[PDB]
Amino acid sequence: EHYNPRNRLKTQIKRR
Amino acid sequence: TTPEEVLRKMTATWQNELCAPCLLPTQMELVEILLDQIQGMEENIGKQTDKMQLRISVHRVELQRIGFITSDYVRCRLQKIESNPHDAIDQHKKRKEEGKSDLLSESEMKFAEEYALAESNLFQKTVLEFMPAALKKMPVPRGDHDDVMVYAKVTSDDVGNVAIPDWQDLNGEVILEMEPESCHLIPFESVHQLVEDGNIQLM
Amino acid sequence: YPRITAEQENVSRVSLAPLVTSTMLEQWQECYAELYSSYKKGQRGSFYVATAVCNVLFTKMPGQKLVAVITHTTSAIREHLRSQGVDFEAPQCLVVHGSKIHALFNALMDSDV
Amino acid sequence: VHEKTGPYTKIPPTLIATSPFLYGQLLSLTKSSNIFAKAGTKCTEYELKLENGPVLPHCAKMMTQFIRSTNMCSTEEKPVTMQVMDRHTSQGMSDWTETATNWNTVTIAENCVKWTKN
Amino acid sequence: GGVADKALQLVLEMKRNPDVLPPYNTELVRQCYQKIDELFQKNAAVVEKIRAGLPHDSTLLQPRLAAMCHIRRCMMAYVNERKNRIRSFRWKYGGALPASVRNALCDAEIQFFNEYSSTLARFQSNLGEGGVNLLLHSAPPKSLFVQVRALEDYGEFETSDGTQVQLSKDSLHSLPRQDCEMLIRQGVLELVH
Amino acid sequence: AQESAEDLPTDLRIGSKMRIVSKVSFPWMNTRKSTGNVIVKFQTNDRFDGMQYFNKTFLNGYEDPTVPLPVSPMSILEAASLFYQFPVIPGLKM
Amino acid sequence: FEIQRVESKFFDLDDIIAKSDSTSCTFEIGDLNPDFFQEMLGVSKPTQNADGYGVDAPYWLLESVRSSFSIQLPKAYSVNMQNVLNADSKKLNLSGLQQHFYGNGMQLCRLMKGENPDGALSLARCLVSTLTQRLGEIVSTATHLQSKGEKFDSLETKVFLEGKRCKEDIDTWLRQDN
Amino acid sequence: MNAERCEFIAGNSLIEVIPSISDDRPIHLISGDIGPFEAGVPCRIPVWTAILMKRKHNCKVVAPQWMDVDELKKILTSETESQGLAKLPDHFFEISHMLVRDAREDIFEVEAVKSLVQDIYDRRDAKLRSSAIEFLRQNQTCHAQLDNVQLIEASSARATLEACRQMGAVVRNKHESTPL
């Protein structure tokens, strides 16, 4: 899998 | 909302915070998002086996730039709080009573209270315990940003009209029109609300 | 007074700065509008106008009918008023009545002549 | 009193009256007005100005009647204020009698008119 | 001299000496305590005559009060200027006081330095997950790597990628900027142009 | 301290400027509540009627306090703002 | 732990030094206890004339005198000097006259308002004219490398220092690009 | 705010380069995707990335269209004729100085371009000086209009703000000294 900042932001939106 | 939009908003916030003479409403949300993005990119690069190639250097230079922006913003706000901590608490409470957006985040407020106590201890141990009983109150200066000027540029289309003091007759005021590409030398308190709303960029 | 250039003595030499003449023109433009407004839609009976190539009277006939009279015209003046759109009775003098007076008011306000 | 040197070279003194006289010209003050709004409050403010001539004593007396006729006092809990400027250049003209007063800023209501002790 | 001539000398003492902090002047501060107390006792005696309804002179009460407030303003301004001079040192080089500076302080000022440093570190710990060192990124970044000369035998050092470097006296290195910025501040390395 | 009366006390010193501030809008303004400049706009016979009321007040050479009022209050505003002056030069302040 | 709100320039050393200056003044005979001259000023006996006791007093003390007193303008603010400075102040050494020129003038206006309103207004007009004649020269003089700002007031020094700071920054940025 | 931070903000602009390396995937920056790279085919990237590649010999920089000598002459003509400041491209002086510093091999007609940029800077500097001097003689207003000023030009001229703040105090003192 290829890393992307948007997936990280979606994960943090689910966290906070 | 994309991180590409969050960074662009953060840069304009940083420029306005550097130029303004007093404390703008806090934007620590964008700071927290960008710090998390830095950590995610760092761990992703750490999973790589090969590092002497062009992509890793390009990514690391971008992380350098984002770290500079966030660090300089936080340093400027702390240096503003240290000048007069009690007045900052007072302004935050007044904005809360008016029902407006926050002046200080939770960690900033905690820092302000602890610094105020630490500053009070030195004066109490050096001078104020030796005073007569009437003179034992702690002095706190009033605000000082009354006659400050700024260079300001208009970006929004429908800003409208602004009022400024009249130097020919200081009982009254003069009204100005702000066409949507102009640059002005103007007092800060006339454009304060528009700088909060993001319709004006300070230079 | 009198203004009409055929009837003049050697009237005295005068020179004035641009500021005085320009401010005087702005004052005249207000003042003429006030006289015409009070006359048309109020109790003011009549007034006179004198000018370098003409002579004008505004009056009313005994809830009344408004009349305007011009005297001492020429062929060029009569043609120029029709070119300005003032169209009139022509019995040298001239007569205008009613709604057509408004065009003469505009011509007197605006015209180069 | 007849200036021989300056911007008013050979121009005689000014005369002013409130009833016609020979060579007197009838004139009017310049008027303008503004709206100010601030801080999301109820307090929008409405401003009227009269400028570019002498403000003779009858002017304030008639302006009081303009306000009271147009019923701006109806919420007397929200007053209306009036101010006249540069009267110190003519200081002394109200001292010779008990019928006059020095004042600079005045509050109007329907029931009363108020000023400071001055 | 006049009533307030002692107080102005504190202000002139701080005004004449930028940057390099002079030693603390306990004795002049103490004399200012005593002069304020003497003025208060005089006004208290006049106040007791007024309360008793005795003959009294009320004219000097406000001059004595003005003198007391002026002396207090001078003393607190002296302390505040020294406080700003002290607080600047947490951001110069590494966050520590020199011995030559610490010998000039009083104990309350040393306590204030420790309280301020603890408060600043506690604030720094809450940024993000791992905290942020705010002495890093002090200027816009020009490049990734830096060229440095080592001034002393520091020994073994390791970069953030896990590469070992042997910092020894009079040797040249090419290192990432973020890793060795702290050593440049602490005086172990110097930049090579 | 405060001093008061039923009606405006007379002051005979001539001044250079008058300013009036209110929390209630003036009649020609009532469309608007945004910050901005507004023209004092007159309507129909109001100016002429104010001129009539002014001359009728001062016809004897001194003030008559018993003249009836005009119908438009805009005429009262106009009648308050008039005077006679000499000498005359356009474009010079006197 | 109770808080007292005070002036925005409470801690300013320059403002304290400005308050510490003194001016020549005169007090009515017998209307004040002669303990005052030893108690506050340290003078054993006042100098006396037909008009009153004549002394010098500091500004911080003069604000507290709710009794009657009178002020004489110092040498740098006398009316002949006011005419000279209002005529031409573009190249004069104001620091040779007074290092806190505009500040002491503003203090004098606030004190003289109750005695002499016309003199207070005249001095205020003179101060505005004097600063207007010199601000452009200050902002221009800051751009030279050899300028050192010898003649300027403490108020004018702030403008001079800010201009020289900006000039140094832009010259340092330009000389990278050789 | 200072000249280094002005150059830092100017680095975010976009510029076109021709790579000599090649790569398959895009590069997913936090500021957005920039790749992929093909050798000999131009594409647009940020200015900081372009200078970073140019130092490593990985590309060739293509100058902006406003660095043509004819375009610079048009700008100089408009700046000479207009009374106020003429309009310029964004970050004009900063991008000019950065490209002359790091990529002067790829600029065409370098000395003529450099001389024209210096001419434009000289007369804009004179206009700003005259405007500030004429403002500081004022007493009637505390406002001026300065359309088409650049950020670095605004940064170099902060003494006027301090001078106006000092003037306002004396004006307020005169107003409070006016009798009643």
mmCIF file of N, CA and C in Angstrom, chain H residues 25-116:
data_model
loop_
_atom_site.group_PDB
_atom_site.id
_atom_site.type_symbol
_atom_site.label_atom_id
_atom_site.label_comp_id
_atom_site.label_asym_id
_atom_site.label_seq_id
_atom_site.Cartn_x
_atom_site.Cartn_y
_atom_site.Cartn_z
ATOM 1 N N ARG H 25 5.725 6.747 -9.862
ATOM 2 C CA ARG H 25 4.580 7.194 -9.083
ATOM 3 C C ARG H 25 4.601 8.713 -8.967
ATOM 4 N N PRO H 26 3.495 9.333 -8.556
ATOM 5 C CA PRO H 26 3.569 10.723 -8.092
ATOM 6 C C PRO H 26 4.272 10.817 -6.743
ATOM 7 N N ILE H 27 4.521 12.055 -6.329
ATOM 8 C CA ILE H 27 5.001 12.350 -4.985
ATOM 9 C C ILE H 27 3.883 13.084 -4.263
ATOM 10 N N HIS H 28 3.428 12.488 -3.153
ATOM 11 C CA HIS H 28 2.263 12.945 -2.396
ATOM 12 C C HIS H 28 2.732 13.854 -1.266
ATOM 13 N N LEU H 29 2.991 15.107 -1.617
ATOM 14 C CA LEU H 29 3.307 16.098 -0.608
ATOM 15 C C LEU H 29 2.050 16.474 0.173
ATOM 16 N N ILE H 30 2.265 17.003 1.383
ATOM 17 C CA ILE H 30 1.180 17.566 2.189
ATOM 18 C C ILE H 30 0.572 18.782 1.489
ATOM 19 N N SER H 31 1.370 19.496 0.698
ATOM 20 C CA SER H 31 0.888 20.569 -0.156
ATOM 21 C C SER H 31 0.354 20.080 -1.506
ATOM 22 N N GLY H 32 0.235 18.774 -1.715
ATOM 23 C CA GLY H 32 -0.394 18.247 -2.908
ATOM 24 C C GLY H 32 0.597 17.534 -3.818
ATOM 25 N N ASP H 33 0.048 16.671 -4.679
ATOM 26 C CA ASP H 33 0.841 15.819 -5.563
ATOM 27 C C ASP H 33 1.586 16.638 -6.610
ATOM 28 N N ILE H 34 2.808 16.198 -6.940
ATOM 29 C CA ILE H 34 3.565 16.944 -7.953
ATOM 30 C C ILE H 34 4.006 16.100 -9.149
ATOM 31 N N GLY H 35 4.172 14.791 -8.965
ATOM 32 C CA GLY H 35 4.746 13.951 -9.998
ATOM 33 C C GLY H 35 3.726 13.464 -11.009
ATOM 34 N N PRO H 36 4.092 12.462 -11.834
ATOM 35 C CA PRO H 36 5.407 11.809 -11.994
ATOM 36 C C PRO H 36 6.361 12.573 -12.910
ATOM 37 N N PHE H 37 7.650 12.236 -12.880
ATOM 38 C CA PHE H 37 8.660 12.889 -13.703
ATOM 39 C C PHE H 37 9.017 12.014 -14.897
ATOM 40 N N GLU H 38 9.061 12.625 -16.078
ATOM 41 C CA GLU H 38 9.594 12.011 -17.286
ATOM 42 C C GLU H 38 10.696 12.911 -17.825
ATOM 43 N N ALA H 39 11.799 12.299 -18.263
ATOM 44 C CA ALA H 39 12.947 13.051 -18.755
ATOM 45 C C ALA H 39 12.613 13.769 -20.059
ATOM 46 N N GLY H 40 12.888 15.071 -20.096
ATOM 47 C CA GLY H 40 12.671 15.875 -21.279
ATOM 48 C C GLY H 40 11.267 16.411 -21.470
ATOM 49 N N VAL H 41 10.359 16.178 -20.529
ATOM 50 C CA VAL H 41 8.974 16.625 -20.616
ATOM 51 C C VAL H 41 8.717 17.581 -19.455
ATOM 52 N N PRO H 42 8.324 18.833 -19.705
ATOM 53 C CA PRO H 42 8.187 19.802 -18.608
ATOM 54 C C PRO H 42 6.960 19.558 -17.738
ATOM 55 N N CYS H 43 7.045 20.067 -16.505
ATOM 56 C CA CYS H 43 5.953 20.005 -15.537
ATOM 57 C C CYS H 43 6.169 21.081 -14.479
ATOM 58 N N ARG H 44 5.113 21.363 -13.715
ATOM 59 C CA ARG H 44 5.097 22.458 -12.747
ATOM 60 C C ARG H 44 5.226 21.922 -11.327
ATOM 61 N N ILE H 45 6.111 22.534 -10.536
ATOM 62 C CA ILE H 45 6.399 22.145 -9.151
ATOM 63 C C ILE H 45 6.601 23.430 -8.342
ATOM 64 N N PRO H 46 6.665 23.403 -7.000
ATOM 65 C CA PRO H 46 7.021 24.624 -6.261
ATOM 66 C C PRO H 46 8.454 25.086 -6.505
ATOM 67 N N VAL H 47 8.670 26.381 -6.229
ATOM 68 C CA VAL H 47 9.956 27.043 -6.471
ATOM 69 C C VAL H 47 11.050 26.456 -5.578
ATOM 70 N N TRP H 48 10.708 26.141 -4.318
ATOM 71 C CA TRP H 48 11.676 25.543 -3.398
ATOM 72 C C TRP H 48 12.112 24.158 -3.871
ATOM 73 N N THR H 49 11.165 23.373 -4.398
ATOM 74 C CA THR H 49 11.479 22.062 -4.963
ATOM 75 C C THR H 49 12.330 22.191 -6.221
ATOM 76 N N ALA H 50 12.052 23.216 -7.037
ATOM 77 C CA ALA H 50 12.822 23.452 -8.258
ATOM 78 C C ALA H 50 14.275 23.800 -7.960
ATOM 79 N N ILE H 51 14.501 24.661 -6.964
ATOM 80 C CA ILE H 51 15.860 25.029 -6.564
ATOM 81 C C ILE H 51 16.586 23.834 -5.945
ATOM 82 N N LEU H 52 15.855 23.013 -5.171
ATOM 83 C CA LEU H 52 16.420 21.794 -4.587
ATOM 84 C C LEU H 52 16.867 20.794 -5.654
ATOM 85 N N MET H 53 16.083 20.637 -6.727
ATOM 86 C CA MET H 53 16.494 19.749 -7.817
ATOM 87 C C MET H 53 17.656 20.331 -8.623
ATOM 88 N N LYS H 54 17.636 21.655 -8.850
ATOM 89 C CA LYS H 54 18.673 22.322 -9.640
ATOM 90 C C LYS H 54 20.041 22.221 -8.976
ATOM 91 N N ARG H 55 20.080 22.272 -7.639
ATOM 92 C CA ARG H 55 21.346 22.072 -6.931
ATOM 93 C C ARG H 55 21.881 20.649 -7.086
ATOM 94 N N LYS H 56 21.002 19.660 -7.212
ATOM 95 C CA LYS H 56 21.404 18.270 -7.373
ATOM 96 C C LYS H 56 21.552 17.845 -8.827
ATOM 97 N N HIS H 57 21.434 18.787 -9.776
ATOM 98 C CA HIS H 57 21.608 18.588 -11.224
ATOM 99 C C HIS H 57 20.530 17.694 -11.817
ATOM 100 N N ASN H 58 19.366 17.626 -11.183
ATOM 101 C CA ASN H 58 18.321 16.700 -11.586
ATOM 102 C C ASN H 58 17.330 17.296 -12.576
ATOM 103 N N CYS H 59 17.484 18.564 -12.963
ATOM 104 C CA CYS H 59 16.500 19.208 -13.825
ATOM 105 C C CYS H 59 17.108 20.431 -14.502
ATOM 106 N N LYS H 60 16.282 21.088 -15.316
ATOM 107 C CA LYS H 60 16.548 22.393 -15.906
ATOM 108 C C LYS H 60 15.344 23.285 -15.630
ATOM 109 N N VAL H 61 15.602 24.513 -15.191
ATOM 110 C CA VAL H 61 14.553 25.460 -14.824
ATOM 111 C C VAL H 61 14.163 26.270 -16.054
ATOM 112 N N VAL H 62 12.859 26.465 -16.243
ATOM 113 C CA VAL H 62 12.316 27.335 -17.278
ATOM 114 C C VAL H 62 11.865 28.623 -16.601
ATOM 115 N N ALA H 63 12.404 29.752 -17.063
ATOM 116 C CA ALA H 63 12.150 31.055 -16.462
ATOM 117 C C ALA H 63 10.696 31.478 -16.693
ATOM 118 N N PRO H 64 10.145 32.346 -15.833
ATOM 119 C CA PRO H 64 8.785 32.850 -16.072
ATOM 120 C C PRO H 64 8.707 33.714 -17.320
ATOM 121 N N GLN H 65 7.476 33.848 -17.830
ATOM 122 C CA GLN H 65 7.248 34.617 -19.050
ATOM 123 C C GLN H 65 7.518 36.101 -18.854
ATOM 124 N N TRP H 66 7.360 36.608 -17.631
ATOM 125 C CA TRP H 66 7.620 38.016 -17.365
ATOM 126 C C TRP H 66 9.104 38.352 -17.257
ATOM 127 N N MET H 67 10.001 37.376 -17.382
ATOM 128 C CA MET H 67 11.430 37.641 -17.477
ATOM 129 C C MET H 67 11.900 37.855 -18.909
ATOM 130 N N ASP H 68 10.989 37.846 -19.881
ATOM 131 C CA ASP H 68 11.329 38.276 -21.229
ATOM 132 C C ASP H 68 11.632 39.770 -21.223
ATOM 133 N N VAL H 69 12.615 40.160 -22.046
ATOM 134 C CA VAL H 69 13.135 41.528 -22.062
ATOM 135 C C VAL H 69 12.062 42.511 -22.526
ATOM 136 N N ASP H 70 11.237 42.095 -23.497
ATOM 137 C CA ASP H 70 10.122 42.917 -23.968
ATOM 138 C C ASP H 70 9.078 43.143 -22.875
ATOM 139 N N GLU H 71 8.766 42.092 -22.105
ATOM 140 C CA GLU H 71 7.812 42.210 -21.002
ATOM 141 C C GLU H 71 8.338 43.118 -19.896
ATOM 142 N N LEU H 72 9.637 43.007 -19.591
ATOM 143 C CA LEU H 72 10.261 43.889 -18.604
ATOM 144 C C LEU H 72 10.255 45.343 -19.070
ATOM 145 N N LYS H 73 10.447 45.568 -20.375
ATOM 146 C CA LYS H 73 10.372 46.922 -20.921
ATOM 147 C C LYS H 73 8.958 47.490 -20.843
ATOM 148 N N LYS H 74 7.940 46.640 -21.048
ATOM 149 C CA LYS H 74 6.547 47.063 -20.864
ATOM 150 C C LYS H 74 6.266 47.475 -19.423
ATOM 151 N N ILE H 75 6.769 46.683 -18.467
ATOM 152 C CA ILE H 75 6.611 46.979 -17.042
ATOM 153 C C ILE H 75 7.292 48.298 -16.681
ATOM 154 N N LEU H 76 8.503 48.517 -17.212
ATOM 155 C CA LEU H 76 9.241 49.753 -16.956
ATOM 156 C C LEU H 76 8.542 50.969 -17.561
ATOM 157 N N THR H 77 7.940 50.804 -18.747
ATOM 158 C CA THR H 77 7.175 51.879 -19.382
ATOM 159 C C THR H 77 5.959 52.275 -18.549
ATOM 160 N N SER H 78 5.202 51.276 -18.073
ATOM 161 C CA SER H 78 4.025 51.549 -17.247
ATOM 162 C C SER H 78 4.401 52.186 -15.911
ATOM 163 N N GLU H 79 5.490 51.706 -15.295
ATOM 164 C CA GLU H 79 5.963 52.266 -14.032
ATOM 165 C C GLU H 79 6.469 53.695 -14.196
ATOM 166 N N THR H 80 7.082 54.007 -15.343
ATOM 167 C CA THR H 80 7.520 55.375 -15.603
ATOM 168 C C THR H 80 6.334 56.309 -15.817
ATOM 169 N N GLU H 81 5.319 55.855 -16.558
ATOM 170 C CA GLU H 81 4.216 56.751 -16.899
ATOM 171 C C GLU H 81 3.253 56.979 -15.735
ATOM 172 N N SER H 82 2.960 55.946 -14.945
ATOM 173 C CA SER H 82 1.964 56.080 -13.886
ATOM 174 C C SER H 82 2.491 56.909 -12.716
ATOM 175 N N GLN H 83 1.582 57.655 -12.080
ATOM 176 C CA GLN H 83 1.963 58.453 -10.920
ATOM 177 C C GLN H 83 2.119 57.600 -9.669
ATOM 178 N N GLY H 84 1.201 56.664 -9.447
ATOM 179 C CA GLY H 84 1.312 55.718 -8.360
ATOM 180 C C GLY H 84 2.137 54.511 -8.759
ATOM 181 N N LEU H 85 2.134 53.513 -7.880
ATOM 182 C CA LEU H 85 2.850 52.274 -8.147
ATOM 183 C C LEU H 85 2.081 51.437 -9.160
ATOM 184 N N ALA H 86 2.780 50.970 -10.190
ATOM 185 C CA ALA H 86 2.176 50.082 -11.169
ATOM 186 C C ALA H 86 2.067 48.670 -10.605
ATOM 187 N N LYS H 87 1.208 47.865 -11.227
ATOM 188 C CA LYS H 87 1.019 46.495 -10.778
ATOM 189 C C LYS H 87 2.090 45.582 -11.370
ATOM 190 N N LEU H 88 2.501 44.603 -10.576
ATOM 191 C CA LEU H 88 3.596 43.688 -10.863
ATOM 192 C C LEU H 88 3.110 42.262 -10.671
ATOM 193 N N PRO H 89 3.853 41.266 -11.173
ATOM 194 C CA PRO H 89 3.583 39.881 -10.765
ATOM 195 C C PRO H 89 3.857 39.663 -9.283
ATOM 196 N N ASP H 90 3.267 38.591 -8.752
ATOM 197 C CA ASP H 90 3.416 38.256 -7.340
ATOM 198 C C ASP H 90 4.846 37.842 -7.024
ATOM 199 N N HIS H 91 5.377 38.407 -5.925
ATOM 200 C CA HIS H 91 6.715 38.124 -5.384
ATOM 201 C C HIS H 91 7.813 38.370 -6.417
ATOM 202 N N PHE H 92 7.685 39.495 -7.133
ATOM 203 C CA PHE H 92 8.502 39.809 -8.306
ATOM 204 C C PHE H 92 9.986 39.906 -7.958
ATOM 205 N N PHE H 93 10.315 40.735 -6.961
ATOM 206 C CA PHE H 93 11.706 40.951 -6.572
ATOM 207 C C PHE H 93 12.308 39.717 -5.906
ATOM 208 N N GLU H 94 11.524 39.025 -5.069
ATOM 209 C CA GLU H 94 12.019 37.840 -4.369
ATOM 210 C C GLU H 94 12.329 36.700 -5.334
ATOM 211 N N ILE H 95 11.436 36.455 -6.302
ATOM 212 C CA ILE H 95 11.654 35.390 -7.280
ATOM 213 C C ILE H 95 12.821 35.738 -8.203
ATOM 214 N N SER H 96 12.962 37.029 -8.559
ATOM 215 C CA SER H 96 14.101 37.484 -9.361
ATOM 216 C C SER H 96 15.432 37.245 -8.650
ATOM 217 N N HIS H 97 15.502 37.599 -7.361
ATOM 218 C CA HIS H 97 16.736 37.422 -6.598
ATOM 219 C C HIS H 97 17.060 35.949 -6.364
ATOM 220 N N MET H 98 16.038 35.122 -6.088
ATOM 221 C CA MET H 98 16.253 33.687 -5.889
ATOM 222 C C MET H 98 16.760 33.004 -7.156
ATOM 223 N N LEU H 99 16.181 33.346 -8.313
ATOM 224 C CA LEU H 99 16.593 32.696 -9.554
ATOM 225 C C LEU H 99 17.960 33.184 -10.026
ATOM 226 N N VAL H 100 18.287 34.466 -9.808
ATOM 227 C CA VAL H 100 19.635 34.941 -10.132
ATOM 228 C C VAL H 100 20.668 34.320 -9.185
ATOM 229 N N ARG H 101 20.281 34.060 -7.931
ATOM 230 C CA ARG H 101 21.188 33.431 -6.975
ATOM 231 C C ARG H 101 21.491 31.981 -7.344
ATOM 232 N N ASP H 102 20.463 31.190 -7.660
ATOM 233 C CA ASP H 102 20.652 29.747 -7.753
ATOM 234 C C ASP H 102 20.585 29.157 -9.160
ATOM 235 N N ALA H 103 20.061 29.875 -10.153
ATOM 236 C CA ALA H 103 19.792 29.270 -11.457
ATOM 237 C C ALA H 103 20.098 30.228 -12.602
ATOM 238 N N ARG H 104 21.155 31.041 -12.476
ATOM 239 C CA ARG H 104 21.471 32.025 -13.514
ATOM 240 C C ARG H 104 22.007 31.406 -14.806
ATOM 241 N N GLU H 105 22.344 30.112 -14.806
ATOM 242 C CA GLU H 105 22.732 29.419 -16.033
ATOM 243 C C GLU H 105 21.572 29.335 -17.022
ATOM 244 N N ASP H 106 20.347 29.179 -16.520
ATOM 245 C CA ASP H 106 19.185 28.934 -17.364
ATOM 246 C C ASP H 106 18.450 30.201 -17.790
ATOM 247 N N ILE H 107 18.720 31.344 -17.155
ATOM 248 C CA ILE H 107 18.143 32.610 -17.597
ATOM 249 C C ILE H 107 18.801 33.022 -18.915
ATOM 250 N N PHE H 108 18.004 33.613 -19.804
ATOM 251 C CA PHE H 108 18.434 34.063 -21.119
ATOM 252 C C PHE H 108 18.441 35.587 -21.127
ATOM 253 N N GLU H 109 19.514 36.173 -21.683
ATOM 254 C CA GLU H 109 19.813 37.618 -21.679
ATOM 255 C C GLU H 109 19.922 38.163 -20.253
ATOM 256 N N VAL H 110 20.871 37.581 -19.505
ATOM 257 C CA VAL H 110 20.916 37.700 -18.044
ATOM 258 C C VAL H 110 21.224 39.128 -17.608
ATOM 259 N N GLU H 111 22.214 39.763 -18.247
ATOM 260 C CA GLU H 111 22.636 41.105 -17.847
ATOM 261 C C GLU H 111 21.569 42.154 -18.156
ATOM 262 N N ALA H 112 20.902 42.026 -19.310
ATOM 263 C CA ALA H 112 19.815 42.937 -19.664
ATOM 264 C C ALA H 112 18.622 42.785 -18.724
ATOM 265 N N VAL H 113 18.273 41.532 -18.382
ATOM 266 C CA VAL H 113 17.193 41.249 -17.430
ATOM 267 C C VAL H 113 17.504 41.861 -16.066
ATOM 268 N N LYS H 114 18.748 41.674 -15.608
ATOM 269 C CA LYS H 114 19.217 42.173 -14.317
ATOM 270 C C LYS H 114 19.174 43.701 -14.245
ATOM 271 N N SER H 115 19.620 44.365 -15.320
ATOM 272 C CA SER H 115 19.624 45.827 -15.368
ATOM 273 C C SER H 115 18.210 46.407 -15.380
ATOM 274 N N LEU H 116 17.286 45.764 -16.113
ATOM 275 C CA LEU H 116 15.900 46.239 -16.147
ATOM 276 C C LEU H 116 15.210 46.095 -14.789
#
